[PDB]
Design an enzyme around this catalytic site. Sequence first.
Site, PDB file in Angstrom:
ATOM      1  N   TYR A  75       0.824  -1.190   0.000  1.00 50.83           N
ATOM      2  CA  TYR A  75       0.000   0.000   0.000  1.00 50.83           C
ATOM      3  C   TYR A  75       0.876   1.266   0.000  1.00 50.83           C
ATOM      4  CZ  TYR A  75      -4.477  -2.358   1.354  1.00 50.83           C
ATOM      5  OH  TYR A  75      -5.640  -3.081   1.383  1.00 50.83           O
ATOM      6  N   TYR A 118      -9.794   2.317  -2.298  1.00 56.39           N
ATOM      7  CA  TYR A 118     -10.511   2.783  -3.475  1.00 56.39           C
ATOM      8  C   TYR A 118     -11.900   3.370  -3.227  1.00 56.39           C
ATOM      9  CZ  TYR A 118      -6.817   0.734  -6.395  1.00 56.39           C
ATOM     10  OH  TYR A 118      -5.610   0.438  -6.968  1.00 56.39           O
ATOM     11  N   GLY A 137       0.594  10.018 -19.328  1.00 57.51           N
ATOM     12  CA  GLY A 137       0.091  11.378 -19.213  1.00 57.51           C
ATOM     13  C   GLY A 137      -0.598  11.524 -17.861  1.00 57.51           C
ATOM     14  N   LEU A 139      -0.200   9.869 -15.182  1.00 61.36           N
ATOM     15  CA  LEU A 139       0.771   9.789 -14.110  1.00 61.36           C
ATOM     16  C   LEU A 139       1.523  11.100 -13.957  1.00 61.36           C
ATOM     17  CD1 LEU A 139       2.071   8.203 -11.870  1.00 61.36           C
ATOM     18  CD2 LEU A 139       3.645   7.186 -13.599  1.00 61.36           C
ATOM     19  N   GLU A 172      -0.447  -1.742  -7.816  1.00 63.42           N
ATOM     20  CA  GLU A 172      -1.147  -2.835  -8.490  1.00 63.42           C
ATOM     21  C   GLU A 172      -0.275  -3.488  -9.563  1.00 63.42           C
ATOM     22  OE1 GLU A 172      -3.608  -3.748  -6.986  1.00 63.42           O
ATOM     23  OE2 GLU A 172      -4.941  -2.098  -6.389  1.00 63.42           O
ATOM     24  N   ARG A 175       2.015  -5.841  -7.964  1.00 61.23           N
ATOM     25  CA  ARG A 175       1.297  -7.022  -7.523  1.00 61.23           C
ATOM     26  C   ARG A 175       0.942  -7.973  -8.657  1.00 61.23           C
ATOM     27  NH1 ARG A 175      -2.265  -2.914  -4.574  1.00 61.23           N
ATOM     28  NH2 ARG A 175      -1.600  -2.966  -2.367  1.00 61.23           N
TER      29      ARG A 175
END
Length: 258
Positions: A75, A118, A137, A139, A172, A175
Amino acid sequence: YPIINFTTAGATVQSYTNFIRAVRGRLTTGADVRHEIPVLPNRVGLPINQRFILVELSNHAELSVTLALDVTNAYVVGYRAGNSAYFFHPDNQEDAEAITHLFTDVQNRYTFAFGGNYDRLEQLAGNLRENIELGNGPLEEAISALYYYSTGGTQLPTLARSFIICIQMISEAARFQYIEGEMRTRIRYNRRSAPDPSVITLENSWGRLSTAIQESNQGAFASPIQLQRRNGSKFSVYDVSILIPIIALMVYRCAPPP
């Protein structure tokens, strides 16, 4: 705490791949593996000096922000931008004490009253993940948004949206190789696009998948797990075999059987 750098400036599939690969290397020791899938360090008894890793993100606008990731679950617990750092609402006394070990020298420290999950972020953002575009973009823009928050240049909805982007493109992707793959595609063709149901469902099922695999009988799940294809159609997972190319890391759920 270990630091991994990445910049959206001139990002390529290869630079993004090396980055994610480095994150995975810092997240897990590679000691715990089950049916070929690495497991993140067990939080129980994990020394505080090995509890986090830092991900410094820079962009074409020459702005930098540093995210702090918890190695036990990948996290994003908070971030630093200049003389200010912000942390998501701690969840237990342990986590609250743990984050005081991050960005210890920042002049201004703040702890949000909300979590980084979320449901919350989408609520504050005014948009669901399926309606938030991901790519280089987004990001690049997320980094700037995070950077100017402390000076009043970023409204909360945009801040939350930015977290959603960063969390998916960093945590993610680390992961799941299947979501790292989705991001690689976006970078390769310089196309920004919201995550399809296959990405969304994997994200929501990470915990269940980690547990099913670890508690499986020689790899076979006691109860199937339902995921979604890109077109949103449902499909079941009955064994760990089919997930090997998909999941790269698992949250620690139990001790491995003899």
